[PDB]
Symmetry: C2
Subunit: 117 residues, 2 copies
């Protein structure tokens, strides 16, 4: 079916649509989101589900603009420009920032997403 | 002085020139080269020195062509197309391949290079 590149792209679409359940549907049960060579930020499919849902609630306008998308072997790398927009929780405007998201894959499911910032 | 991007670029120049000592001069003493989320392939400044020197001996024509170079925070990512060329040791022609090299930095020195392939 979808290439890993197409899958990562479907995830980011889902992310930009703030469709949590669609986003996590592409992951392994144990998939995490983590900082590159660093800590896990969302643990497991379910931690990702609840964590994104919370981010989306805090930042309803949250958007990632894809600047570069590459498939390298089974890995997908996407350079993303992220704009939180105004928070709902009284917290201050997070300034736009850039990251590279590295998607690992096990078969056709995303096993990890790591952030380089 | 040099940005981290300029430093990574100096390393790759040195690499393409097969100038081992120049390449490692930009690294921390404990810097490693490793597979992304995987094993160390060259351990320490000195393991990198001896390991590159051995690669270069095996593949004197070895070349990395930079396809994309980005600095993200302190990290540098370079998408590289690598051509080993004919080996000196009777081993068969390694077909050209693509990788992304992720350079970590501690201050102005490279603390790690990881390969996504």
């Amino acid at each position: 079916g979808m290439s890993n590149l197409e899958t990562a792209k479907a995830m980011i679409a889902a992310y930009n649509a703030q469709d949590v359940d669609t986003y996590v549907s592409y992951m392994t049960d144990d998939a995490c989101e983590a900082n590159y060579r660093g800590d896990v930020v969302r643990e497991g499919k379910e931690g990702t589900r609840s964590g994104l849902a919370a981010a989306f609630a805090r930042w309803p306008q949250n958007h990632a603009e894809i600047k570069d998308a590459q498939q390298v072997g089974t890995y997908v790398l996407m350079r993303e420009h992220v704009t939180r927009g105004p928070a709902t929780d009284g917290s201050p405007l997070v300034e736009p920032f850039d990251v590279v998201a590295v998607y690992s894959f096990e078969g056709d499911k995303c096993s990890r997403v790591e952030f380089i910032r």
